[PDB]
Design a protein around this ligand. Structure first.
Ligand SMILES: [Zn+2]
Ligand SMILES: [Zn+2]
Length: 84
């Protein structure tokens, strides 16, 4: 006859810094509509501007206007709302 058992461990986690130390990648903040009168697509280079449609999307950080379809087409990454 011989037996035994024991073990007690605990841990508390939840918040984790989603920032790196090499070159964090920041997406583009697409804002439905809100396009200027002289708007322009940065993917296809076509006349844009949703006067009474408020559809066209445009980044607020890099300030890049793109179409709904062209959006997915865009590959380049964003820099951010501010760095220096
Ligand atoms: Zn952007
Ligand atoms: Zn476009």
């Amino acid at each position: 006859g011989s037996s035994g058992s024991s073990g007690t461990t605990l841990a508390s986690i939840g918040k984790d810094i989603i920032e790196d130390a090499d070159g964090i990648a920041m997406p583009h903040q697409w804002l439905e509509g809100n396009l200027p009168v002289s708007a322009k697509c940065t993917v296809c280079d076509k006349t844009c501007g949703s006067v009474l449609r408020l559809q066209d999307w445009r980044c607020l950080w890099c300030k890049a206007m793109v179409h709904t379809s062209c959006k997915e087409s865009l590959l380049t990454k964003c820099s951010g709302p501010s760095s220096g």
